Amino acid sequence: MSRLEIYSPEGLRLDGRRWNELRRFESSINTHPHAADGSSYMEQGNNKIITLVKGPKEPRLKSQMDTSKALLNVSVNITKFSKFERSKSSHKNERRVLEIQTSLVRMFEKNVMLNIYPRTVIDIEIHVLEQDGGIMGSLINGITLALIDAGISMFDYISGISVGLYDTTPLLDTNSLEENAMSTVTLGVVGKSEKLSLLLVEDKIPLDRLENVLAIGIAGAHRVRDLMDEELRKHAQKR
Amino acid sequence: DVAIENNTLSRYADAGNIDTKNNILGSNVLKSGKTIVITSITGGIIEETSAAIKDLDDFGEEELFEVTKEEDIIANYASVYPVVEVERGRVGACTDEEMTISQKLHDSILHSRILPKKALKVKAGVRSANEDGTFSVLYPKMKRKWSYVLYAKIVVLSRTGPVFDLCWNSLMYALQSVKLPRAFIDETYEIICDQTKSVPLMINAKNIAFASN
Amino acid sequence: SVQAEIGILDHVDGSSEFVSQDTKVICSVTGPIEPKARQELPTQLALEIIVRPAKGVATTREKVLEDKLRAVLTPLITRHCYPRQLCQITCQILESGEDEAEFSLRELSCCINAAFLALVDAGIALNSMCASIPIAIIKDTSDIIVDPTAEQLKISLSVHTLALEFVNGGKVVKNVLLLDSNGDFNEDQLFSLLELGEQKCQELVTNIRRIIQDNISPRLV
Amino acid sequence: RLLGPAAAKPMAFSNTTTHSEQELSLHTGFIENCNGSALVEARSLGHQTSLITAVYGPRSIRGSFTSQGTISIQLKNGLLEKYNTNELKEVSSFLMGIFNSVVNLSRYPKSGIDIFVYLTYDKDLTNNPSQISSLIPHCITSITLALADAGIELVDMAGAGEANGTVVSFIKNGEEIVGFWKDDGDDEDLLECLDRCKEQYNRYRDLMISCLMNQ
Amino acid sequence: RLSLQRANVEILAVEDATFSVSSDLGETFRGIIRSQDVRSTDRDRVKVIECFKPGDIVRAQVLSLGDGTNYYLTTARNDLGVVFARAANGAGGLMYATDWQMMTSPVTGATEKRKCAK
Amino acid sequence: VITITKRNGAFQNSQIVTPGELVTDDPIWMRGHGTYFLDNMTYSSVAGTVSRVNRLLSVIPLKGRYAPETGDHVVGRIAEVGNKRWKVDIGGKQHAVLMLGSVNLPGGILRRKSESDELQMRSFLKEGDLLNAEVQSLFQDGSASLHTRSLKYGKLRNGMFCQVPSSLIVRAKNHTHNLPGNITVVLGVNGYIWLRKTSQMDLARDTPSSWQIYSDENDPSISNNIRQAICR
Amino acid sequence: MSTFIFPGDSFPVDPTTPVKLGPGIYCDPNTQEIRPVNTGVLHVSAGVQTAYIDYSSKRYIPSVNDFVIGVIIGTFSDSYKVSLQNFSSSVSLSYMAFPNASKKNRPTLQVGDLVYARVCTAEKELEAEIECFDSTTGRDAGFGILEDGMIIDVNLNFARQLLFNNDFPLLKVLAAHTKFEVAIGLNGKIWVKCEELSNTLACYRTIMECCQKNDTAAFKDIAKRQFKEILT
Amino acid sequence: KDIEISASESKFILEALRQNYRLDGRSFDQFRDVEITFGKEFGDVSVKMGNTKVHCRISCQIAQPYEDRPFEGLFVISTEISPMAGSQFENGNITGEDEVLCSRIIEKSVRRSGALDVEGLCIVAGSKCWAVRADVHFLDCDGGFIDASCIAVMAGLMHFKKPDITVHGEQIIVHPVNEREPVPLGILHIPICVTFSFFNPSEISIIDATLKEELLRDGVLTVTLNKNREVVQVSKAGGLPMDALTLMKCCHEAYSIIEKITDQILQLLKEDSEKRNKYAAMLTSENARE
Amino acid sequence: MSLSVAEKSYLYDSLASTPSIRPDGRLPHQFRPIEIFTDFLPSSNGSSRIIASDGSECIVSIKSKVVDHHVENELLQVDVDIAGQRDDALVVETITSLLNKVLKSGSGVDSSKLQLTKKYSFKIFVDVLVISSHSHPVSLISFAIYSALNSTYLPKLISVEELPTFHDYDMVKLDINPPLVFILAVVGNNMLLDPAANESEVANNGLIISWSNGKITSPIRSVALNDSNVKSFKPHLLKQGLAMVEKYAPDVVRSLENL
RNA sequence: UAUUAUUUAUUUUAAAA
């Protein structure tokens, strides 16, 4: 927009929220029943993500078959219209996608009981329709909810949350404008525990300030698990 | 035995009926035995900037440049950027053969001193807008400078053996038949080439060579 | 004078490092190992030649550098006593020692000398020995010079890469493996540098034989 | 090297600086790499076309168990009048839908046929300013020639013609249509399009047998 | 390709003595000569390393389509077997057939055991 | 005419346990599906209802593919002809295997030597063929092992294929039933259904070898009223 | 008579006296001349006069009657798949190549198990074969699974000097510090094992350091300093 | 075409870890001794830490800036791996997980985290800028690929020097390297990567695992700090789930390592600068009075 | 799924009969139920989502860019991305080349309705995302770009030549006649409209027909639906199919322009 | 013809006597 106040002395951010308030979290299950085994339409703030789980199924070619566990493939498709300016495909932009996809595979292959499904493959197709900051955390929430819809056995929830640090004030669920003005940490918290399955720090953060950011990060991620858990309760009781 | 046809695909094939929507500055269709080589030469133009220390107007820096400058003989010569396409009934990216031939043609054209850099300069013009003569172009120190860039594409058909010698001999014929279209500027003002007027490429016949294995 | 080392890399069968003027090339050899389906040869050994530039990615310039380096090492290896096997020869150019946009002979010559030494360290059956030197002639005084500097290349009329094959104590020149010439020269200059090069390569193998013997002898018993 | 300097721009020619019968020539059998060759050339009004077609087949596919054969047609740019790669592949899929109804596929089990068409020269001499419709009939006649030279069974000959962007390919002396292509053009017109293309189809149907029976 | 119980080959010609034979053409057939189809005398328990070598030309009659991917050939006849081989996997001289399972080169004089045809 | 449901504005329109939560802390239980053991306590791995049968503690998830069991009259499609077996598409997590020594061969046994085992199978049972069989046994991973060792099971023809979810198949004594209008339904417990004209066998066997069943030849004359009955 | 030689050099043996061809020299199938192909020390033994070259190498080539340490990488119906060295071609180990073998009994060997075997077939045009009991002499003592312990990578010359030459003081200097059991494979592998892990660890570090330091007289100071360090 | 680890070798290395034993003789928090070697030309650095050897090569050229940031220079990095570092690597596999992660981490540490002064690389806004390129060559793989590569790139950037530029009104002239001595790049802070390897038989964490320890690993963590107590970047995805207490212990242990390595690069650069500037005491122009 | 050769011959004889026995038994002019969502992407000028009966789904986004039409040729660009396929695939480049012809500026879409100043105009970026597809989706995508272009809002222009300026809040509605594409399958001598998955597998040939301004417009194709049974058709079938779309296309436009 | 098989092995029931 323009020159804005990031965190006013009145404790209000540029979009009206406060330091510990999340963006609106509207999740949906079973949005694509005739196109995948697991579906989750993730709408976190202005982020709009479609996650499709196809599996466990027989691999198309025996060159990708494991006789002791399933193979996990995560495909992240960032649409040309996810932002304001219609971005053109860049050769450099392909490297950042591979790092995200690999980080997601290594994250959920440890939490999803792949041993129960041997000689099978689990394809995760993701389509990002719009992004507005905190896209990495929202991708995690879509995968967790889509795997549960597909009946894939997991050990616990994996909650994705993004925390920013402005001067000395940490801020929960950073949007696009806030990420452009501060350092951002994304976390992958496992269930109600304080254990992390993902930790990405892509900007400079003082070492003495990192301890507190993680505490508020894992805390706000528990709230994300509640929002995802409640959506599964309402969808199971009404059906 | 070889049989060639120069300027067959060129924009300047007919001196009277010069093609309007053509691009090829000169071509050659060679055939030795049963192999077929088709070689056309398009071209572009690039604007060069004066990054010389002469423009500093300082005697000390200029004298230091003249003392420390080392001689670079091949720096005064340019080369063509060829694109070889040997049709062997396959799909995919560039074959190792196509890439090696392109590099050899570039390295041999550059070392044999066929195209000096001063021979690819652009005698820049300025087309005017005199009264109801619509436009009029004039030709000759000017500020902005330009240089011709030559692109060549080679298509080898019915390959029966090593075709590097055939690609080189076909390129040496097409080079001896290219004309540089005269360029001018209007009076945000990019450069424009002439529709019909052109100057043949001044290639020294001393340095032209032919291949045989 | 040239510098060379052997057995520098751990996770390969044979390695080497060849230095001349400012050109530095590290080469590694691994073989015989299991070849790929698109690589195996029914009767003889398959070669995988890879040369990588000091700057940027591997362009088509290194592709013709592979093809020339391949034409030298292929007759230099007893391929038939390794049927359905693979040999990976990888040359890494640390410093080019010359203008990459203009010349590539000082890197080709060092890759040949580095590959031969690495093939010796690996234990591949070699039919003979090999030496390679760069040759140039100066414009003003048409003088033939062996192992020219980077500045002499920019003042030369033609550049040459001579790769010879040595047998019997490094005295009998069995054949001329590679003679790559580019520039301006006639028949008289060719045999003038070819005769001059045959005696400069002859003292190179004599120095190479001393280099590899000073390293392999402490290994054996 | 390749591509060249990125700062260079292609030459620009200005339009303000100085200012019935469709000829045909056919040849076949001249590429040693492939089985069947073809070379069709046509120059009518201010538009000259010359393209080369090669057929590499039938190729036995390893491990394949298909009942009939598979045809692969690929258009490739040449040296003049370069078209976009998307439209070239669109004509390729249109052409494959034609020859899959003409080539005897049941006579080639567990094998494929690869077609290669090279638009080597598509000259255009209009005075002052889809253009691909004028080449589809010439490409169909070129593939049928190279397919016949390669000893491949073709159920009847196949030809086509243009009628203001309307390309129709006929078979059995125009009794049945095997392909339909129409870009731009006008409305209501259809009876005259099928008529102007059918007479152009018979003009190409017998001229292909001329060079195929000689030499 | 030589396996312990089979010999992968590449069909180069076929009968039409007149024959028919075709580079980047991409048209070639391949078959498999099983150990059970090498000889008629004592079919089981043989040694294909002593009957064939990589690069040898083998005249063999087909049996049937093996598995679609490969053909099944046989050499259990006196006129079927190695018809053109070279010493040391092509690294030697042109050898010629002599006995029913012996092949020798004139110049080099070296002998190598094959499954010849005469 | 078309019926286009239009929406504007947005993108679209017992105990319940979730993966990770505790179901019980009693060690005296036998953990079943949707359930994993950890630190002498019992947790859930899926989202569904808790089930208690004798001592078998399990969680039944909401959405789930077909779980094959021993003795299931299923309908499957052949995927590939493999080494001494077939891969049949039953609709579960993995392809079920149909061994060679588990079907009614045409000539009783193989006619060898001539071709391999795999190539001879494609002559009568190629890829994409539809058939019905019974799950003889199960593998350790849960894969099904089919068999066609009776005249009741064979290669389907003279009909049309449709698919329903596997959970919506009510259990009954008979797997296939005769229907009014000279039509016979084959309700596969895996969700695969085959609607065909009533044949001579299923009509004369449910009321009171040879390669004739592996023939792809359909019935020559089918009534135009019978085919339109299959659509309804 | 021992001298350093190079490829292409003149073979210092008269063609009159018959000489046996060994590893290092090559007989050209065309010119029939004997020429070197490797670089090392030439050895000639003055009944039978054999000749070979001792060259430095690390890539093991399978040769018959060689004791090797292999890693099982594949279980099959009638044989194992064993890897003698990384990236090399795998070798074959049949189930009948064991003491008291039986066709009705599968061996209890899994992947990742170290086996001490003997190369019984090394055809250049075929896959090499190994066995866990000598088919020629009936030996079986020492062959088989190498349970626990640690395997070490050494060059082929260090492994051959350790198995054959009894004057190599590495085995003696190790026994002065700890009791162990060793298995030496000609493919560059050395398997050691002690009672306590701390002793096996010091044996690993010594054999590693002694392989790169060709000074044979330094083996005593290596084991002295290495065993004294683990005590901290 | 992969590395085969025997069951006994895996059990021995893990049990040795349960007894505080590493085959090489280091502690669990001990970084391998790094050795920096500089080549003839500027930006030529070879790093050796243990048996791991990596060679870096810095270069630059005039390029077009990004339209989103017309006042910043570009930074390119390629970390392709040849079969030279081990036959398990396939030549041409540029999209591999190791190649991508190594490039992204050094890219975040150098370019994104402001280690390289991209604003000083601006020649003419929106048209002309310096594109500093870093080529990384994996010579011998014994683990610690991104740790060695980050030391090579950071040493190369501080050792690299770009051609000089004079501003003359609206004209800009690039002096040849033979006339005027090239100008060094702007290096704000020095980020150094430290990778942690985790095991479980109560978890064990080792610093800078070797190739053998890297294959038996159950989880990997990469942290990047500078001497300014700043966390440049952290990358942890999957493996053994860890808590904030274990990470902060990793960061505090890594800070003790990156602080010593930083002082070494600064010292080894000073020694290399004096070696190639022997007669620099006579050529000083700006001198003191009296 | 695939189809066995036994049931393939069952559908051919039932579809080619003079009473066309459709699998679902609909009439040769009846369509399947369709769900269409619109206006859900705030960052885009227009958006739509369509869900077919066989689970096929397609998402369309419409972005805008101020460009000088004196230098920008095509003012309407279509960018298709089918899930599970590469961007250089043949099945993608054909539809991409075809959709840019039905929506060509100055042909199927008049460039006058998206012009601004004498110098400048709007460039429409139509991005297609096929999530699921069972048959040829060129007809399903054409319905999605229809409902999206008929719900697209572009910024209102505020008006010596200078660069154009736009109002902060008020925006104009894009009123453009969006062409429609239909797929026809010929099975013997019967012409079918909107063929299903199994129906398009036994068809003898296929027909693609565009429809704009209440009439048939360019382009029209005759691409095959399956390489197995590719049969040449009588020209009277081409006329019957070309005349059948004229009889039922207004019923589609009326049922599609209600939003 | 799964107590059957795949050879550089796509087997995914080799257990009992």
Asked whether the CA dihedral G121, G123, G127, G128 is positive or negative, the reply is: positive
The experimental resolution of this structure, in angstroms, equals 3.1
Nearest to B192 among D4, D14, D125 (CB): D14
- Domains of chain A listed by start with CATH number: 1-239 (3.30.230.70)
Residue F143: nearest nucleotide (C-alpha to C1'): J12
* Pairwise CB contact (< 8 Å): B68 & H176: yes
Give the burial class of G79: count Cβ atoms within 10 A of its Cβ; 0-12 exposed, 13-18 middle, 19 or more buried: middle
Run of H or E residues at D142:
helix D136-149
- Chain D partners of C61 at a C-beta cutoff of 8 Å? 1
Run of H or E residues at D85:
helix D85-99
CA distance F119 to chain D (A): 10
Residue B40 bridge partners (DSSP): B27, B153
CATH number of H1-290: 3.30.230.70
CB C58 within 8 A of CB C98: no
Could you give the C-alpha distances from A73 to B64, E19, E29, in angstroms and in order? 62, 52, 37
Whether residues F47 and F140 share a domain: the answer is: no
Which chain J nucleotides are covered by protein, judged by CB under 7 A?
Answer: 1-17
CA distance H89 to chain C (A): 11
Vertex I70 angle, CA D184 and I155, to 5°: 95
Which residues are CB-neighbours of C32 under 8 A, at least 6 positions away? C45, C82, C85, C86, C87, C124, G59, G61, G88
- Residue of chain H with shortest Cα separation from G87: H1
CB B195 within 8 A of CB B173: no
Query: Interface of chain H against chain B, CB under 8 Å?
Result: 166, 168, 171-176, 178-179
Residue G106: nearest nucleotide (C-alpha to C1'): J14
Which residues are CB-neighbours of B166 under 8 A, at least 6 positions away? B30, B32, B35, B37, B156, B211
CB C11 within 8 A of CB C99: no
Range of the domain at F145: 67-201+213-232
Tokens of A40: 């989750």
Task: Residue window 56-95, chain B: list those with CB within 8 Å of chain E.
Answer: 88-90
Q: Which CATH class is domain I1-259?
A: alpha beta
Whether residues F20 and F41 share a domain: the answer is: yes
R_g (Cα) of chain I, nearest Å: 20
Which residue from C48, C24, C52, C54 is spatially nearest to C35, judged by alpha carbons? C48
Which amino acid, one-letter code, is at C3?
Q
Tokens of D193: 């399009």
Give the burial class of H165: count Cβ atoms within 10 A of its Cβ; 0-12 exposed, 13-18 middle, 19 or more buried: middle
Which residues are CB-neighbours of B70 under 8 A, at least 6 positions away? C151, C154, C155, H178
Q: How many angstroms separate the CA of F117 from the C1' of J6?
A: 12
- For helices I138-149 and I90-102, what crossing angle results, to 10°? 40
What span, in angstroms and rounded, lies between the C-alpha atoms of I34 and I56? 10
Q: Burial letters for I33-53: b for 16+ Cβ neighbours within 10 Å, e otherwise?
A: ebbbbbbbbebbbbbbbbbbb
* Pairwise CB contact (< 8 Å): A233 & F36: no
What span, in angstroms and rounded, lies between the C-alpha atoms of I168 and F207? 78
Whether residues F85 and F54 share a domain: the answer is: no
What span, in angstroms and rounded, lies between the C-alpha atoms of B132 and C205? 80
Which residue from G126, G124, G130, G206 is spatially nearest to G173, judged by alpha carbons? G206
- Domains of chain G listed by start with CATH number: 1-57 (2.40.50.100), 58-148 (2.40.50.140), 149-232 (3.30.1370.10)
* DSSP class per residue in chain I: ----HHHHHHHHHHHSSSS---SS---TTPPPPEEEEE---TTSSEEEEEE-TTS-EEEEEEEEEEEETTT---SEEEEEEETTS-TT-HHHHHHHHHHHHHT-BTTTB-GGGGB-SSSEEEEEEEEEEEEE-SS-THHHHHHHHHHHHTT-EEEEEE------EEEEEEEEE------EEEEEEEETTEEEES--TTGGGS-SEEEEEEEETTEEEEEEE---S-SSS---B-HHHHHHHHHHHHHHHHHHHHHHS--
Q: How many residues does chain C have?
A: 221
* Chain C touching partners, 3 or more CB pairs below 8 A: B, D, E, G, H
Run of H or E residues at A186:
strand A183-190
Which residue from C171, C206, C210 is spatially nearest to G4, judged by alpha carbons? C210
Does any domain span residue F208? no
Q: Are β-strands B81-86 and B145-157 bridged in parallel, bridged antiparallel, or unpaired?
A: parallel
What span, in angstroms and rounded, lies between the C-alpha atoms of G167 and I103? 88
What span, in angstroms and rounded, lies between the C-alpha atoms of H112 and I97? 39
What span, in angstroms and rounded, lies between the C-alpha atoms of D160 and D94? 13
SS (H, E, C) chain B: CEECCECCCCCCCCCCCCCCCCCCCEEEEEEECCEEEEEEEEEEEEEECCCCHHHHCCHHHHHHHHHHCCCCHHHHEECCEEEEEECCCCCCCCCHHHHHHHHHHHHHHHHCCCEEHHHHECCCEEEECCCCCCCEEECCCCCCEEEEEEEEEEEEECCCCCCHHHHHHHHHHHHCCCEEEEEEECCCCCEEEEEEEEEECCCCCCCCCCCCC
Does any domain span residue F3? no
What span, in angstroms and rounded, lies between the C-alpha atoms of H115 and H188? 5
Optimal mutation site among H84, H103, H212, interface C, most CBs of chain C within 10 A: H84
Q: Is D72 helix (H, G, I), strand (E, B) or coil?
A: strand
Residue G126: nearest nucleotide (C-alpha to C1'): J8
- Residue of chain C with shortest Cα separation from E90: C43
Tokens of G76: 């099959």
Q: How many angstroms separate the CA of C38 from the C1' of J4?
A: 34
Neighbours of F40 (CB within 10 A): 8
- Chain A partners of F48 at a C-beta cutoff of 8 Å? 236
> Which CATH architecture is the domain D1-215 placed in?
2-Layer Sandwich (3.30)
Place of tokens 């029209």: I220
Q: Is G84 helix (H, G, I), strand (E, B) or coil?
A: coil
Nearest to G73 among H4, H11, H19 (CB): H4
Could you give the C-alpha distances from I98 to A169, I77, I241, in angstroms and in order? 54, 11, 20
Whether residues F155 and F232 share a domain: the answer is: yes
Domain locations along chain I = 1-259
Whether residues F112 and F32 share a domain: the answer is: no
I13 touching F (Cβ < 8 Å): yes
Which residues are CB-neighbours of I234 under 8 A, at least 6 positions away? D175, D176, D177, I189
What span, in angstroms and rounded, lies between the C-alpha atoms of B135 and E61? 82
Vertex D147 angle, CA D144 and D149, to 5°: 110
Task: Residue window 80-139, chain B: list those with CB within 8 Å of chain C.
Answer: 96, 99-100, 102-104, 107-108, 111-113
What span, in angstroms and rounded, lies between the C-alpha atoms of G19 and G50? 5
Which amino acid, one-letter code, is at D167?
V
Nearest to B45 among D8, D74, D80 (CB): D8
Domain locations along chain D = 1-215
**Main-chain dihedrals φ then ψ at residue H268, nearest 5 degrees:** -70, -30
Could you give the C-alpha distances from F103 to F84, F155, F209, F211, in angstroms and in order? 12, 11, 10, 11
CB A155 within 8 A of CB F20: yes
What span, in angstroms and rounded, lies between the C-alpha atoms of I27 and I12? 16
What span, in angstroms and rounded, lies between the C-alpha atoms of A149 and F46? 9
CB F91 within 8 A of CB F135: no
Does any domain span residue F53? yes
Could you give the C-alpha distances from F90 to F65, F122, F144, I65, in angstroms and in order? 10, 19, 9, 51
Which residues are CB-neighbours of C5 under 8 A, at least 6 positions away? C16, C17, C215
Domain locations along chain C = 1-221
CA distance F39 to chain A (A): 13
**Main-chain dihedrals φ then ψ at residue G109, nearest 5 degrees:** -105, 135
Neighbours of A187 (CB within 10 A): 28
Q: Burial letters for B142-172: b for 16+ Cβ neighbours within 10 Å, e otherwise?
A: eeeebbbbbbbbbbbbbbeeebbebbbbbbb
Peptide bond into I219 cis (omega under 30): yes
Whether residues F52 and F76 share a domain: the answer is: no
* Pairwise CB contact (< 8 Å): D33 & E68: no
Does any domain span residue F218? yes
Which residue from H158, H85, H101, H59 is spatially nearest to C53, judged by alpha carbons? H59
E25 touching B (Cβ < 8 Å): yes
| Total structural domains within chain E | 1
Q: Does C1-221 carry CATH code 3.30.230.70? A: yes
- Residue of chain H with shortest Cα separation from G199: H16
Whether residues F106 and F181 share a domain: the answer is: yes
SS (H, E, C) chain H: CCCCCCHHHHHHHHHHHHCCCCCCCCCCCCCCCEEEEECCCCCEEEEEECCEEEEEEEECCEECCECCECCCCEEEEECCCCHHHCCCCCCCCCCCHHHHHHHHHHHHHHHHCCCECCHHHEEECCCEEEEEEEEEEEEECCCCHHHHHHHHHHHHHHHCEECCEEEECCEEEECCCCCCCCEECCECCCCEEEEEEEECCCCEEEECCCHHHHHCCCEEEEEEECCCCEEEEEEEEEEEEECHHHHHHHHHHHHHHHHHHHHHHHHHHHHHHHHCCHHHHCCCCCCCCC
What span, in angstroms and rounded, lies between the C-alpha atoms of A221 and A158? 9
**For residue E100, what is the domain's CATH number?**
2.40.50.140
What span, in angstroms and rounded, lies between the C-alpha atoms of A104 and A197? 10
Which amino acid, one-letter code, is at C61?
R
- For helices H97-107 and H145-159, what crossing angle results, to 10°? 40
Q: What is the largest CA-CA distance in chain C?
A: 55
DSSP assignment letter at F88: E
Q: Is D16 helix (H, G, I), strand (E, B) or coil?
A: coil
Helices (H), G114-229: 156-163, 170-175, 197-212, 219-229
Which phi-psi region, left, alpha or beta, contains residue C7 (left: φ > 0; alpha: ψ -120 to 50)? left
What span, in angstroms and rounded, lies between the C-alpha atoms of H213 and H197? 8
What span, in angstroms and rounded, lies between the C-alpha atoms of B95 and B98? 5
What span, in angstroms and rounded, lies between the C-alpha atoms of G145 and G71? 10
What span, in angstroms and rounded, lies between the C-alpha atoms of D116 and B88? 10
**Main-chain dihedrals φ then ψ at residue C33, nearest 5 degrees:** -130, 170
Residue closest to J5 C1′ by Cα: F84
* Chain E touching partners, 3 or more CB pairs below 8 A: B, C, D, F, G
What span, in angstroms and rounded, lies between the C-alpha atoms of F125 and B12? 66
B75 touching C (Cβ < 8 Å): yes
CB F45 within 8 A of CB F59: yes
Domain locations along chain H = 1-290
DSSP assignment letter at G161: H
What span, in angstroms and rounded, lies between the C-alpha atoms of I105 and G157? 77
Residue D112 bridge partners (DSSP): D59, D70
- Residue of chain D with shortest Cα separation from E27: D59
Vertex F177 angle, CA F173 and F181, to 5°: 160
**Main-chain dihedrals φ then ψ at residue E37, nearest 5 degrees:** -110, 20
Q: Are β-strands G2-5 and G40-44 bridged in parallel, bridged antiparallel, or unpaired?
A: antiparallel
CB D138 within 8 A of CB D50: no
What span, in angstroms and rounded, lies between the C-alpha atoms of H85 and C163? 28
* Chain G touching partners, 3 or more CB pairs below 8 A: C, E, H
